[PDB]
Design a protein around this ligand. Sequence first.
Ligand SMILES: *[C@@H]1O[C@H](CO[C@@H]2O[C@@H](C)[C@@H](O)[C@@H](O)[C@@H]2O)[C@@H](O[C@@H]2O[C@H](CO)[C@@H](O[C@@H]3O[C@H](CO[C@H]4O[C@H](CO)[C@@H](O)[C@H](O)[C@@H]4O[C@@H]4O[C@H](CO)[C@@H](O)[C@H](O)[C@H]4NC(C)=O)[C@@H](O)[C@H](O[C@H]4O[C@H](CO)[C@@H](O)[C@H](O)[C@@H]4O[C@@H]4O[C@H](CO)[C@@H](O)[C@H](O)[C@H]4NC(C)=O)[C@@H]3O)[C@H](O)[C@H]2NC(C)=O)[C@H](O)[C@H]1NC(C)=O
Ligand SMILES: [K+]
Lengths: 186, 218
Amino acid sequence: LFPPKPKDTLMISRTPEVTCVVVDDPEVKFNWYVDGVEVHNAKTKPRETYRVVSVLTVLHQDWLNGKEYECKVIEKTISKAKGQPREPQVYTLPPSRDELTKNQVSLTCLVKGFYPSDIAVEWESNGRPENNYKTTPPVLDSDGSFFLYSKLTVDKSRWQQGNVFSCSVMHEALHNHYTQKSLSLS
Amino acid sequence: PPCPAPELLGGPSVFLFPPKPKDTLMISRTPEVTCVVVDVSHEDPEVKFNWYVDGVEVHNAKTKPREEQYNSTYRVVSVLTVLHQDWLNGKEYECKVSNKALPAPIEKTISKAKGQPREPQVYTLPPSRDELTKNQVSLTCLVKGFYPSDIAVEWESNGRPENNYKTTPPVLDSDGSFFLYSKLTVDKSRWQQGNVFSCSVMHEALHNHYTQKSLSLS
Ligand SMILES: *[C@@H]1O[C@H](CO[C@@H]2O[C@@H](C)[C@@H](O)[C@@H](O)[C@@H]2O)[C@@H](O[C@@H]2O[C@H](CO)[C@@H](O[C@@H]3O[C@H](CO[C@H]4O[C@H](CO)[C@@H](O)[C@H](O)[C@@H]4O[C@@H]4O[C@H](CO)[C@@H](O)[C@H](O)[C@H]4NC(C)=O)[C@@H](O)[C@H](O[C@H]4O[C@H](CO)[C@@H](O)[C@H](O)[C@@H]4O[C@@H]4O[C@H](CO)[C@@H](O)[C@H](O)[C@H]4NC(C)=O)[C@@H]3O)[C@H](O)[C@H]2NC(C)=O)[C@H](O)[C@H]1NC(C)=O
Ligand SMILES: [K+]
């Protein structure tokens, strides 16, 4: 079993789903038990050795409250990490002086000290999303928490102006499951 | 009432491993291609290694002693020392293992990433204006636009290495290259005292396979 994408579980915009994957007789049996009670609102994807995948749509309040989901083929149970939540520290980093010589600069967002690793980072400017950005996977730090970096690449002309860029971070331990930190030239 | 011997119904598995990226780029270390054979049946423990470098057989390998694991099985490792020039040019290395418990000999091959190299751009980033409140500040090193992913990152201060750092794995960027970050955590007192820290990056596409960028308080 595989957990849903952290944004699907922390944002009401996308529908989260728990995915059961079987790799390596094409008849298979999937029995989904949500918190003990058997549910029959799951759909199994077509097969394609062959691999059969079963998907059960979960509710945002259901997953975020840590209710357990069981896939019965083999019996596997998955849920949110039971560790004590830690609030992410969000800091923005301007491009280096040595990078200003190039035509595009890299705006850096450090998101440190959060738990669990389930998180989602996005970049936005003037209310519109940004296209050219990538974010590292969460990295286990020394104190048992997690950190990551998010790199937004914009044209230097936008940075050379007074344009304002903001780092959007979404974590379970955040107020309203959402926070922002801005970054601009001055 | 002791249970009987383990079943071990199957065959020995083999896993080939490339040399460490640091050893392949620094003249102070010896790079090795490692051929590990696991699940060696105790009834038939003899293993035979045939090393092939791009087709031509090599006979300059060393085999480490057997190691019996907690699951009562053996582990036979054979190591082949490689030349820095040969690995960096993309030479293929083939390990051929032969055992009585294997129906046909298992063969694995490892080599350097074949793409057109890209030179990394290294930038150091000082702690954020908000982070100076804490007793420890984060020193950030951005390494972007390099291919292949095999790379080595370290930190250093006053000619001595800095150990308390963490580096993210390589992340595929939009242009087919890679980027990553390395976070060095130091006491705000050391950062305020004007000490100079350095991010050292080791990549095959760099000049002399090495570069440094320093960082100090303004
Ligand atoms: C009996 O037990 C032993 C060992 O267990 C020991 O005792 C128990 C009690 C525990 O305490 C264990 O911790 C302890 O080790 C069993 O032997 C194990 O067998 C499994 C597989 O059955 C092996 O897993 C493989 O792991 C490799 C990478 O492993 C690294 O990390 C290990 C620690 O996590 C470390 O011990 C390894 O040595 C190795 O670390 C490397 O070490 C070398 C030193 O020689 C060093 O040079 C390297 O730098 C270093 N590297 C790193 C990163 O640390 C993993 O890569 C394998 O996965 C491949 O294969 C899978 C298919 O089985 C697949 O699912 C994976 O995705 C991956 O797929 C491959 O990907 C490559 C990528 O290019 C691709 O080319 C391939 O085509 C693709 N497919 C294949 C088939 O390769 C794999 O998971 C353990 O390493 C091994 N432990 C050993 C040898 O110590 C034994 O099986 C048990 N037997 C029984 C009967 O129970
Ligand atoms: K040499």
